[PDB]
């Protein structure tokens, strides 16, 4: 079963297979006063792995490091982060210290930039404009408009059918919206309709946070932030 966060002690990840070559990451950390989880990806690149988002802090990170090296032992060689926040790049200078060549969008540079988080070395072109899509090795990086944040992108991995909508995306669990501080609540609903539009083959859907359904958390996410903006 998919691991919850009351199992996951924080400092600890766990690795869960969602297809061949496909990993979510998953990791625990505090965030006003609670603690919750947070899922990342990891895709099989030929001999190497590439990683999407870092486990939520630098602690996390270096155990995810580990973890991977344990279960899978091939090299984590490159990092996307897929928005600014420190469930996304919060782990970035443990990942450059282990040789990892750390990826995001130029908007997601900036903006960590001046959150004073941690910045990913290299930018990702072609991603500037929703519905802009590019691809990086076994995946695709899309970018679908501002939602959770303005710079959050998505990845498919088109040979299995694989879904990351990080956290423009919430588990079915969630009815309350929370940390929408960076959101742009009227275009968020539109940006889930292009990932659908683009997406609509998708088999499994990663969200940010909790557990892993199918395109259902899209129209689930749009009823959740359009139910906060009409109170
Ligand atoms: C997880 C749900 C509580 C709010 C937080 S904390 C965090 N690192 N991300 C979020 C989010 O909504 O994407
Ligand atoms: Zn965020
Ligand atoms: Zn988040």
Do not use: I
């Given at each position: 079963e998919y691991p919850t966060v009351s199992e996951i002690p924080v400092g600890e990840?766990?690795?869960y297979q969602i297809a061949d070559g496909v990993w979510s990451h998953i990791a625990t950390?505090?965030?006003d006063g609670a603690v919750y989880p947070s899922n990342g990806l990891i895709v099989r690149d030929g001999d190497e792995l590439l990683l999407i988002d870092t486990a939520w802090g630098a602690k996390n990170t270096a155990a995810l490091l580990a973890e991977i090296e344990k279960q899978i032992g091939l090299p984590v060689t490159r990092?996307?982060?897929?928005?600014?926040?420190?469930?996304?790049?919060?782990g970035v200078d443990v990942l450059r210290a282990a040789g990892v060549?750390?990826?995001a969008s130029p908007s997601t540079r900036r903006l960590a930039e001046v959150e004073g988080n941690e910045i990913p070395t290299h930018?990702?072109?072609?991603?500037?404009?929703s519905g802009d899509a590019v691809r990086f090795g076994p995946v695709?990086?899309?970018?679908?408009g501002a939602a959770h944040s303005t710079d959050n992108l998505v990845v498919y991995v088109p040979s299995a059918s694989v879904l990351y909508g990080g956290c423009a995306i919430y588990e079915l669990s969630r009815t309350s919206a929370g940390n929408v501080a960076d959101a742009d609540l009227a275009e968020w609903p539109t940006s889930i309709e292009r990932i659908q539009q683009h997406y609509?083959?998708?088999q499994f859907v990663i969200?940010?946070?909790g557990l892993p359904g199918g395109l259902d958390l899209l129209k689930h996410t749009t009823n959740v932030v359009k139910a906060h903006t009409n109170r």
């Open positions: 990840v766990r690795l950390q505090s965030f990092a996307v982060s897929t928005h600014f926040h420190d469930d996304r790049v919060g060549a750390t990826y930018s990702l072109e072609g991603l500037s404009s695709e990086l899309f970018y679908p609509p083959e998708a969200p940010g946070h």
